[PDB]
């Protein structure tokens, strides 16, 4: 008894950035003694700021951080009602970013898997506050982890987000503009011959999965906040090439 050693934020962030989990011993003991969680202001860069898990994901080696599992375990064992996994960062650079968003943004499937396997909400919303404003690291990708993976051309990630048995991500989910992943692709698309080809490939792939995962729901008839289906939006936005593609699919 009569313990345990102080484990401040500075030290925790140093260890998670380097990657070695063996130096996290004593953290659980301290947290529990003082009834503290890794989501408290004391352990984040300002209340509402980076959690230690986001710091872990921001420092990848080979696509993984060996701290992520130990960290998510410590949080579980500490009795946190609001799991560290679903915490969202919101500072000068980030806006509603979960570790999941960062994991997808860092193009790491093994890290995405790892997070989803430990109760990550695949429906948290990032970059909702900023809409064609150049402020932080935020851009429009449709503010949904699935949309992000699709807009960033990561099929293997899209595949896993839709199929995994832990937390499947619905294709029917919409962002603050009522925009589905299909809408987001139309938006994200420039009218380059190379880019349009890749967006079409991704677009089609999701409808294939649409037929398998939600066969009853006609994804392409889903209208957004301005009363636009992906077809209508494609015309409004002047994205001629992919508008030409959605058109043909309708006339079959």
Swiss-Prot record:
One of its GO terms (cellular component) is melanosome. Ubiquitously expressed. Expressed in dorsal root ganglia, trigeminal ganglia, spinal cord (Lissauer's tract, dorsal horn and dorsal columns) (at protein level). The keyword Electron transport does not apply. Residues 1-252 are cytoplasmic. The modification Phosphoserine is found at residue 14. Keywords: ANK repeat, Calcium, Calcium channel, Calcium transport, Cell membrane, Cytoplasm, Glycoprotein, Ion channel, Ion transport, Membrane, Phosphoprotein, Repeat, Transmembrane, Transmembrane helix, Transport. GO terms for molecular function: calcium channel activity; identical protein binding; monoatomic cation channel activity. One of its GO terms (biological process) is positive regulation of calcium ion import. N-glycosylated. Phosphorylated by PKA. Residues 1-252 are annotated as: Required for interaction with SLC50A1. It is found in: Cell membrane; Cytoplasm; Melanosome. ANK repeats lie at residues 5-47, 48-94, 95-140, 141-176, 177-225, 226-252. Belongs to the transient receptor (TC 1.A.4) family. TrpV subfamily. TRPV2 sub-subfamily. This is Transient receptor potential cation channel subfamily V member 2. The gene is Trpv2. The chain holds residues 69 to 320 of 761 of the full protein.
